[PDB]
Amino acid sequence: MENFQKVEKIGEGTYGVVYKARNKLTGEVVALKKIRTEGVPSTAIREISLLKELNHPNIVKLLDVIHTENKLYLVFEFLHQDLKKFMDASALTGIPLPLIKSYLFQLLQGLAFCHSHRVLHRDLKPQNLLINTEGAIKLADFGLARAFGVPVRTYTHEVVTLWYRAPEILLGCKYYSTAVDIWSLGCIFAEMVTRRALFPGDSEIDQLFRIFRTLGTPDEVVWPGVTSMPDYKPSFPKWARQDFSKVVPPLDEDGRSLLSQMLHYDPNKRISAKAALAHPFFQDVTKPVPHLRL
Numbered sequence: 001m002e003n004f005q006k007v008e009k010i011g012e013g014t015y016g017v018v019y020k021a022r023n024k025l026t027g028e029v030v031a032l033k034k035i036r037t038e039g040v041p042s043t044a045i046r047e048i049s050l051l052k053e054l055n056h057p058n059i060v061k062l063l064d065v066i067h068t069e070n071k072l073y074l075v076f077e078f079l080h081q082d083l084k085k086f087m088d089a090s091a092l093t094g095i096p097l098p099l100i101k102s103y104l105f106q107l108l109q110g111l112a113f114c115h116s117h118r119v120l121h122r123d124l125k126p127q128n129l130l131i132n133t134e135g136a137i138k139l140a141d142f143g144l145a146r147a148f149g150v151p152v153r154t155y156t157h158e159v160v161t162l163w164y165r166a167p168e169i170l171l172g173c174k175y176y177s178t179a180v181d182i183w184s185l186g187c188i189f190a191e192m193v194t195r196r197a198l199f200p201g202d203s204e205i206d207q208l209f210r211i212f213r214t215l216g217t218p219d220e221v222v223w224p225g226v227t228s229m230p231d232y233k234p235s236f237p238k239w240a241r242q243d244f245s246k247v248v249p250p251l252d253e254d255g256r257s258l259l260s261q262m263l264h265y266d267p268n269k270r271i272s273a274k275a276a277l278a279h280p281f282f283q284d285v286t287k288p289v290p291h292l293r294l
């Protein structure tokens with residue numbers, strides 16, 4: 001758009017190309033996203049407009065929504081790096097626990113805020129968790145999923161990851177709750193600790209079975225109503241639950257306790273962001289400065 005000079009491509013997002021750009025009338029650098037063909041439905045417009053209001057220090061700020069020439073462009077606050085690259089860059093020694101705790105703690109704050117407003121992300125992943133040079137981490141593209149039906153394969157033909165998708169979704173539950181974000185965050189939490197994705201599925205069934213292999217195949221005992229779900233199949237293999245001390249060493253007892261609650265099968269039993277913030281694991285949280293090299 002006229003008022004923006006693209007400086008470079010930051011990547012291919014789920015909803016279109018993302019460009020780092022500079023606003024010509026303010027001089028601020030931002031993250032510009034182009035979305036999508038009918039002319040953009042009113043519904044999408046109102047949902048997005050609502051997002052312009054839910055502001056929080058741990059939520060990437062939506063600066064402007066430009067609907068011109070029947071095209072949708074979203075302008076977001078710009079952050080220099082995502083957790084994905086940061087992790088890859090910290091593969092040798094891993095992200096220090098104090099920093100891991102700080103990041104998880106802030107993410108939960110952002111989630112508690114959005115959830116209190118009944119707004120969920122639905123697609124959390126390292127790629128949309130942005131960090132700055134001041135020890136902060138923020139949630140990006142919050143709420144866009146409900147605004148636009150999330151596709152299986154991006155416009156760039158890139159395969160969208162299922163690694164962080166909650167089991168209720170894999171099983172066909174059509175009414176996701178805020179619990180899906182807690183699950184995603186728990187998977188990411190585990191990944192930061194072990195430096196390896198928790199459930200690297202490459203298909204829905206592979207994703208589902210990897211979950212079943214680590215946490216045990218769910219039944220009516222641990223998850224009432226599981227067998228009545230759309231994609232549940234009595235013929236699912238019956239695996240035993242691995243013990244967490246084996247799944248996320250060397251995370252301490254508090255972390256493992258908290259991770260276990262963020263990973264409960266039953267969405268209703270899964271800990272909320274709010275309750276999570278009061279968990280003993282955060283007893284000694286601090287805000288360390290990351291070693292970022294831009």
Ligand SMILES: Cc1nc(C)c(-c2ccnc(N)n2)s1
Nearest residue numbers: 011013018031077078079140
């Ligand atoms: C793909 C991309 N996804 C996000 C979330 C990107 C980004 C990069 C920099 N700043 C912002 N807000 N967003 S680029």
